[PDB]
Amino acid sequence: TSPPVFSKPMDSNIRQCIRRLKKRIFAAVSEGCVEELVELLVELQELCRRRHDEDVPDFLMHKLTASDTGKTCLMKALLNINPNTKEIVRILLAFAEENDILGRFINAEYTEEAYEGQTALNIAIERRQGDIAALLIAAGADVNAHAKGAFFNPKYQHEGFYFGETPLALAACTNQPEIVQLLMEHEQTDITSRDSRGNNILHALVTVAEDFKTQNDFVKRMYDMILLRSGNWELETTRNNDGLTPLQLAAKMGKAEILKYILSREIKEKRLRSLSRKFTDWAYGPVSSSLYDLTNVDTTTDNSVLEITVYNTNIDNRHEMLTLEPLHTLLHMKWKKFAKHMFFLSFCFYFFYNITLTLVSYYRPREEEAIPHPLALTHKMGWLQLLGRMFVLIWAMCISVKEGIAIFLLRPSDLQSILSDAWFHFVFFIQAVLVILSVFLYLFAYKEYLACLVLAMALGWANMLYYTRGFQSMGMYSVMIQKVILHDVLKFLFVYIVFLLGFGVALASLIEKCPKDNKDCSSYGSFSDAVLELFKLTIGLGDLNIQQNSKYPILFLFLLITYVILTFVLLLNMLIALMGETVENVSKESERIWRLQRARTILEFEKMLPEWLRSRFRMGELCKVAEDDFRLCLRINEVKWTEWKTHVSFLNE
Amino acid sequence: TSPPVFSKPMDSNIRQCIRRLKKRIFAAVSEGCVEELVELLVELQELCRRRHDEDVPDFLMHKLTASDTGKTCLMKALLNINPNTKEIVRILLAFAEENDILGRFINAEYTEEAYEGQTALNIAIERRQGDIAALLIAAGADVNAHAKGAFFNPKYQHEGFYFGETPLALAACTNQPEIVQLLMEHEQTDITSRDSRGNNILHALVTVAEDFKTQNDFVKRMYDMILLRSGNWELETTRNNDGLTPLQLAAKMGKAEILKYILSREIKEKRLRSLSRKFTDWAYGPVSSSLYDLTNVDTTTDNSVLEITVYNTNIDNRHEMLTLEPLHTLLHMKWKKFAKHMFFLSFCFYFFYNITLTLVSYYRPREEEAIPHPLALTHKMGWLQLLGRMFVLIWAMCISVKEGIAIFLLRPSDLQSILSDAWFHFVFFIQAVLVILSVFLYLFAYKEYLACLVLAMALGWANMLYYTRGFQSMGMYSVMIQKVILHDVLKFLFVYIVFLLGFGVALASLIEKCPKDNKDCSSYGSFSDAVLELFKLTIGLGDLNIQQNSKYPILFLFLLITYVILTFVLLLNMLIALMGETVENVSKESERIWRLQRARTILEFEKMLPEWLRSRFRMGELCKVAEDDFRLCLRINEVKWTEWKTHVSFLNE
Ligand SMILES: CCCCCCCC/C=C/CCCCCCCC(=O)O[C@@H](COC(=O)CCCCCCCCCCCCCCC)COP(=O)([O-])OCC[N+](C)(C)C
Ligand SMILES: CCCCCCCC/C=C/CCCCCCCC(=O)O[C@@H](COC(=O)CCCCCCCCCCCCCCC)COP(=O)([O-])OCC[N+](C)(C)C
Ligand SMILES: CCCCCCCC/C=C/CCCCCCCC(=O)O[C@@H](COC(=O)CCCCCCCCCCCCCCC)COP(=O)([O-])OCC[N+](C)(C)C
Ligand SMILES: CCCCCCCC/C=C/CCCCCCCC(=O)O[C@@H](COC(=O)CCCCCCCCCCCCCCC)COP(=O)([O-])OCC[N+](C)(C)C
Ligand SMILES: CCCCCCCC/C=C\CCCCCCCC(=O)O[C@@H](COC(=O)CCCCCCCCCCCCCCC)COP(=O)([O-])OCC[N+](C)(C)C
Ligand SMILES: CCCCCCCC/C=C\CCCCCCCC(=O)O[C@@H](COC(=O)CCCCCCCCCCCCCCC)COP(=O)([O-])OCC[N+](C)(C)C
Ligand SMILES: CCCCCCCC/C=C\CCCCCCCC(=O)O[C@@H](COC(=O)CCCCCCCCCCCCCCC)COP(=O)([O-])OCC[N+](C)(C)C
Ligand SMILES: CCCCCCCC/C=C\CCCCCCCC(=O)O[C@@H](COC(=O)CCCCCCCCCCCCCCC)COP(=O)([O-])OCC[N+](C)(C)C
Ligand SMILES: CCCCCCCC/C=C\CCCCCCCC(=O)O[C@@H](COC(=O)CCCCCCCCCCCCCCC)COP(=O)([O-])OCC[N+](C)(C)C
Ligand SMILES: CCCCCCCC/C=C\CCCCCCCC(=O)O[C@@H](COC(=O)CCCCCCCCCCCCCCC)COP(=O)([O-])OCC[N+](C)(C)C
Ligand SMILES: CCCc1cc(O)c2c(c1)OC(C)(C)[C@@H]1CCC(C)=C[C@@H]21
Ligand SMILES: CCCc1cc(O)c2c(c1)OC(C)(C)[C@@H]1CCC(C)=C[C@@H]21
Ligand code: NA
Secondary structure, three states, X not given: OOXXXXXXXXXXXXXXXXXXXXXXXXXXHHOOOHHHHHHHHHHHHHHHOOXXXXXXXXXXXXXXXXXXXXXXXXXXXXXXXXXXXXXXXXXXXXXXXXXXXXXXXXXXXXXXXXXXXXXXXXXXXHOOOHHHXXXXXXXXXXXXOOOOOOOOOOOOOOOOOOOOOOHHHHHXXXXXXXXHHXXXXXXXXXXXXXXXXXXXXXXXXXXXXXXXXXXXXXXXXXXXXXXXXXXXXXXXXXXXXXXXXXXXXXXXXOOHHHHHHHHOOOOOOOOOOXXXXXXXXXXXXXXXXXXXXXXXXXXXXXXXXXXXXXXXXXXXXXXXXXOOOOHHHHHHHHHHHHHHHHHHHHHHXXXXXXXXXXXXXXXXXXXXXXXXXXXXXXXXXXXXXXXXXHHHHHHHHHHHHHHHHHHHHOOHHHHOOOOXXXXXXXXXXXXXXXXXXXXXXXXXXXXXXXXXXXXXXXXXXXXXXXXXXXXXXXXXXXXXXXXXXXXXXXXXXXXXXXXXXXXXXXXXXHXXXXXXXXXXXXXXXXXXXXXXXXXXXXXXXXXOOOOOEOOOOHHHHHHHHHHHHHHOOOOHHHHHHHHHHHHHHHHHOHHHHHHHHHHHHHHHHHHHOOHHHXXXXXXXXXXXXXXXXXXXXXXXXXXXXXXXXXXXXXXXX | OOOOOOOOOOOOOXXXXXXXXXXXXXXXXXXXXXXXXXXXXXXXXXXXXXOOOOHHHHHHHHHOEOOOOOOEHHHHHHHOOOOOHHHHHHHHHHHHHHOOOOOOOOOOOOOOOOOOOOOHHHHHHHOXXXXXXXXXXXXXXXXXXXXXXXXXXXXXXXXXXXXXXXHHHHHHHOOOHHHHHHHHHOOOOOOOOOOOOOOOHHHHHHOOOOOOOOOOXXXXXHHHHHHHHHOOOOHHHOOOOOOOOHHHHHHHHOOHHHHHHHHOXXXXXXXXXXXXXXXXXOEXXXXXXXXXOOOOOOOOOOOOHHHHHHOOOOOOOHHHOXXXXXXXXXXXXXXXXXXXXXXXXXXXXXXXXHHHHHHHHHHOOOOOOOOOOOOOOOOOOOHHHHHHHHHHHHHHHHHHHHHHHHHHHOOHHHHOOOOOOHHHHHHHHHHHHHHHHHHHHHHHOOOOHHHHHHHHHHHHHHHHHHHHHOOOHHHOHHHHHHHHHHHOOOOOHHHHHHHHHHHHHHHHHHEOOOHHHOOOOOOOOOHXXXXXXXXXXXXXXXXXXXXXXXXXXXXXXXXXXXXHHHHOOOOHHHHHHHHHHHHHHHHHOHHHHHHHHHXXXXXXXXXXXXXXXXHHOOOOOOOEOOOOXXXXXXXXXXXXXXXXXXXXXXXXX
8 A cells, every 4th residue: 555654764874964072983884994994983982081081981872872862873873774784883892892981882773753762782683694693692692682663563454564673584584594592592681571462482483474385385384483492381371461472363364374383383392282272192103092182272262263263254375274184174064063953943944934924924914904913912822823923023033132242243354345144134134123013003993903924924934045055065145145146236236326316306397288188198208207218128018109298309219219229238247247256256165154154153152151051062081191191182094095195105215 | 650761762673674984883882792882983983084074073072972872882882781892882982082072972961852861871880880980080071961751751650760850860869879979979969959849859858768677778778878977967958849848748649768767867976967868866774765756746837747747648659657756756746735626626516506406407497387487687685596506607608718718728639539628618618608598598588498497407417427536435336427428338329220220110111090999099100109119128118019000010019029139139138238248348547537637637627726826836856966966855754665675685695
């Protein structure tokens, strides 16, 4: 989108159009001027020794610090890498040593609010200068820095560089394993240290990964190395300010590959046997067992990876994120255990509810038809009453409440994206409200119950099409009728409704008054009649040259002909082309959308259950893995024939 | 297209079917006849020494020059390269030295008007003969040649070989860097020298480049080498006879890659720091700043690169030419600064104008309907008058003038290509003229104002569809409704209008006169009625066997059936197939056309502004780059995540 905008830049080589010794020093450090550096430092020290001792450190720092932002000559030298930067770095460090300012000088930080908190080690590590990083780390550097500020903590991507506000995080995110090892070995580096939002190095690595495989073993390898060399089950347990762990964060942001690696991370090497989650039990060829860990990947605690992966619509990579067992096996087990039967019961109850509405609407023509009303509570009807009158009115509320909650909990910015069941949550609620209001209307006198009851019946019969997601083959349609009617038949109206309006008045103006023939006498009378006739022309009912027309018959005929040739073709057969394109696009992608909707329904029904039954319908055992650990489990026996065949073919040939 | 045609050819090995010593010499130089060369030259010199001195040079030149075209034996020898051309070249040069004709002989030029002005050095350089080129350059050659004539200066491509009419230009355009260096080092070669149209070597290189990347670093590398070794900011400032610089010429002709290279040419090496246009300020990973130069790339002077890139329709590579910052950033800044609000104001004013027209046309049925007229100037109506009567009539003129200018400035051969906003410039003007003429008609008496007013209202309501280019999603339709109606529903009529005419008279001929039944009595009466009934059959109203038919009922029924099966299908459902193909073709290419039209609108509105506001809405600062230069600037902070990630992955692995 639009380029981001920042305050004063870090290093401005090209001076804009908007004290001597400091500028001399900055220019000298910018390029290779070793002799100039020596002379400038000599004269600077001679000037410095002109006053009392206590002001020597402050004066030296002020002379070597740019008051505009707080930049130090060392940072300028590091930023402008030249084939002889090492010598100037050595000279500056020695000069700092002379006056005993090897401290603050090294650990200098910006002052401008944009790049606040930066330090020399960050710049040294960024520019690949590993040797300078080692020198600074040894001498006096402070690894536990925090590069806060807008530039290092943008509101979103494409507006800054977020890496973790820590030298170790920057080294890991810029693919510098050697610097990572050097920093980790140093005792001062505390690996677990949340910086700004709440993020240990693992979260920083997760939030800069790629959404798929291109060639990058970089992020995955760095994450694995950090987790291993850490040697503790602690990094993957911390939480950020929003309360997420690296696994949950990877699931939420949509980074599929880190999630895949971390769900099934196996450590064959002995003596760890605890940071893994895929304890393999036995394997005899194609058949392979496993003991995947469900400690935080089952909808129990509050925010299991499954719920975050299913109930989020920001990303569109979810189709590959639900075949990353134990997610797939969990969904299958729930579906075959407690979610299909509830789905069928809901279908049957809704169908009988609609049939009851219709049979108390038409079969009996709502009554004897004298001065009647529907169900209400009138007794003395027996069998048809206690079922017909009650079951509807009760069950209607049972919907109005449930969906009423859903719309209340609907998050607009995310859930309004269609294909997230909102288009049905609205219609169910509208139908229930219509039935309730239909009853309440006549309940006083209000003889208008009909319109509302008929609207409710029509909406209910139309919405009963929602339940076609239970069958795989006839499940795509329920998506098309949405995707089309909000992608090709809604943006199309804003075009059509122009022409129909345009010619709607035009034709209505050429007409001439003929009250003489006892009535209208002409097909195109008022605006409404002209619009209706144009619509019937668009669908096709008939036309003819209308008499009683003034200022021309030819103009009227020409206008009608051009409307017909401009709407019945070249518009309708263009909307149809767009509709065909949309159907083709959303017909190949049938498995993904259907499976996603089935998962959403399964999770919704699982939530609907009470705590008792849900506790009964748990999955897993109490695996004892390594000498202290009791973690949940899910024994899933996988079988892979093609993979085993290709492996054995390419192995022993 | 058709092959080009030239006059007498350069070298005619195969004599056509349409003095001795000259032919002997030409034949000897054609192939390897060293001994023949020696003998012929000896006898030629013996003959030459038969007369006085003053005629010796002229006689020698005449004997060694072909009067038909002016070709010299040296040029013939160079054209027919043989494994022993060096020896004959040496012999001819020595012989020229003997008689002191090492001048004119070397600098010989054609006489035929087609290949006029050519010289030996051109032929030597073309044939890869670098050594011969060096020899000629050393001895007496004239580098500052001009190879004029039709063959070297064709009216367009595929009719000649245009390279710059200069040995240096030919060497650079035939990928001969060594010869280029040899010529540049020679002091006589003046690099800046416009030849025929006005072209320094840079323009010649720009006008022979490729429109995209295939493998050719050739043209770009040669351009870079010439510009660098020139070492001055002068070549990119000259102008041709049409007043364009290499940057502008590259933009106009459509060569995208040279434009891309020259907009963002960065010279890292110090001591130049002035031929660049991308002074990079700082970079800390993905985030990168820049100081792109807008000295001649902003719509200020008269013909900035932006205007030439947007307001030209000859090429169709523009879609990649508007993502070559600072063009894209300039467009974004203008759009978010002063072009969106004007667009919305125009939309609102046009919408209210159309609604006023409609409400003074229908809502009031144009009046009490006794003997009325629309707005005119009749007073004593108050609120509805001062707005209804004035705003339209005034605003109409405000359109008729503006569009009236546009059509006047419309260049036919280029702008008539549709998708260049002509299809709307015509309709707006027609609508305004119709409103004005509608008023002026009745203004005397002329009770025909209706037809014109209704036409104006219909056209205005239809054209209000123009404003759908402001929204990205609903912006394609404004292009579909043009492409389809000028590419599939216009070439289709010339077919349909045959059948409807063909059967139009045929069916009208089998009818028989029945004035006996008080009136027509038969559906297919005159030609007009038959045509109308056939059209209604095509769209669908109804049909039946018409009585009162002579010479057969069977023939009439067969003709109608074959028309229905030949038009209602196999023609309409073929136009629909073509329409679907066009919609599919122009639906994928939605971003490009919409962005191009948005850019055109932005530039048009920018032009519309007065000098004051435009001066207020400038962009850039007064960058001071290298020691003398004050040039405009545009600080654009770019961010590239994927590029940085792939670079770092492939760099330190
Ligand atoms: C008698 C007359 C009155 C009758 C009244 C009865 C009703 C008559 C009804 C009439 C409407 C009929 C047409 C419906 C469709 C039109 C488009 C639309 O609705 O949304 C569009 C605008 O996108 C949005 O997100 C809109 C959100 C609106 C609601 C926001 C609620 C926020 C507060 C919280 C809620 C508070 C509680 C609210 C409930 C109390 C959707 O388009 P999109 O976003 O581009 O979709 C993405 C599609 N894609 C993913 C394929 C790309
Ligand atoms: C959501 C998508 C679908 C939309 C709906 C579907 C498409 C469109 C709708 C279709 C339904 C059928 C037609 C409409 C209903 C009839 C009444 C009506 O509306 O118009 C009435 C008046 O209005 C006009 O005459 C309109 C004049 C031209 C359009 C003006 C638009 C701006 C309105 C003004 C803005 C001012 C702003 C001022 C600013 C300074 C018609 O008068 P009538 O002839 O007496 O009525 C018929 C009576 N009869 C039949 C008994 C004889
Ligand atoms: C009551 C009866 C009378 C009514 C009268 C009222 C009007 C009635 C109207 C009737 C016409 C209705 C049909 C319109 C479309 C037909 C085709 C067409 O017009 O151009 C076609 C011919 O291509 C051209 O370029 C034609 C240019 C013509 C104008 C030249 C003006 C030159 C002088 C300067 C101007 C001087 C001032 C002029 C103004 C004063 C366009 O086809 P194309 O070129 O192949 O298009 C490329 C498409 N592509 C890029 C997708 C491939
Ligand atoms: C731009 C694209 C769209 C084009 C328009 C749409 C498609 C075509 C048009 C449709 C509109 C409706 C029909 C036309 C209008 C009616 C009048 C008419 O034109 O014909 C009249 C005469 O002409 C004929 O009878 C024509 C004979 C056959 C075609 C001859 C073509 C050459 C013309 C000659 C060249 C000579 C060259 C000589 C060289 C040596 C018909 O006579 P009529 O029956 O008395 O009229 C009806 C009267 N009534 C209804 C009151 C009874
Ligand atoms: C006869 C008809 C009468 C009514 C006419 C009503 C007309 C007025 C309606 C609305 C006023 C809107 C004003 C704000 C938007 C300005 C344009 C804009 O921002 O476009 C954006 C694209 O936009 C999209 O990509 C959106 C895609 C969906 C468009 C749906 C249009 C539906 C029309 C009905 C909607 C209303 C529904 C309710 C109607 C009652 C791009 O612009 P940007 O983001 O600013 O660009 C900066 C960033 N960028 C350069 C990187 C892109
Ligand atoms: C023998 C093998 C057994 C295997 C395991 C069996 C399953 C597990 C055990 C039991 C099933 C689940 C028990 C808890 C029910 C909680 C309420 C509930 O689910 O409400 C829901 C369903 O509506 C009902 O369930 C109606 C209430 C009674 C359900 C139990 C019937 C008796 C058990 C009969 C058991 C045998 C059944 C035999 C025939 C299949 C409400 O949904 P809704 O109102 O439609 O939602 C409206 C909004 N929406 C449409 C957008 C979603
Ligand atoms: C207004 C209307 C009134 C009537 C409404 C009647 C409605 C009731 C009709 C039938 C009840 C069926 C109950 C059992 C099936 C449950 C779902 C199921 O199993 O789906 C399976 C997919 O299914 C397919 O892939 C089938 C594809 C063809 C579907 C055709 C539907 C025709 C509808 C008419 C049919 C009846 C014809 C006769 C009608 C008189 C998948 O489920 P699974 O296999 O259990 O999943 C485990 C394995 N898996 C996860 C790996 C996949
Ligand atoms: C093939 C597809 C092409 C593309 C689509 C094209 C779509 C075109 C859309 C719309 C145009 C179609 C015609 C609409 C008007 C016809 C009725 C009329 O004119 O008058 C009638 C209504 O008169 C009124 O004043 C009430 C109008 C209420 C709105 C009715 C349309 C709502 C459509 C909402 C659609 C939402 C759909 C959402 C889901 C998609 C009655 O007036 P009358 O006739 O004089 O009768 C006398 C009775 N009276 C005295 C009581 C007045
Ligand atoms: C607070 C933040 C401000 C940000 C910057 C604001 C913008 C910059 C500042 C100012 C806007 C530009 C000023 C110069 C206008 C020159 C004339 C001109 O543009 O004519 C054009 C528009 O028509 C008009 O502009 C009508 C004349 C009055 C415009 C100014 C209104 C008062 C300022 C209100 C300011 C607040 C507005 C608030 C609501 C948006 C004529 O176009 P047309 O006739 O349609 O063209 C016909 C042909 N065509 C259709 C093929 C093209
Ligand atoms: C589905 C699509 C298929 C493909 C397309 C197929 C297209 C086919 C095209 C055309 C053929 C369609 C039929 C046209 C004629 C019908 C009227 C007639 O015959 O007579 C009438 C006109 O009589 C005249 O003499 C005036 C004719 C003026 C031209 C009218 C058509 C202009 C179409 C321009 C279209 C431009 C479109 C540009 C944008 C696209 C009246 O005669 P009558 O009936 O005897 O009534 C008695 C009245 N009278 C006494 C006053 C005479
Ligand atoms: C089948 C796909 C889901 C669905 C269900 C509906 O109830 C309706 C649907 C779509 O489309 C709209 C909103 C245009 C209908 C309006 C009126 C009625 C009678 C029903 C509405
Ligand atoms: C919507 C695309 C732009 C557009 C605008 C128009 O005004 C018209 C358009 C197209 O098509 C033609 C020229 C066939 C129409 C003729 C008659 C009328 C009433 C309008 C004409
Ligand atoms: Na098709």
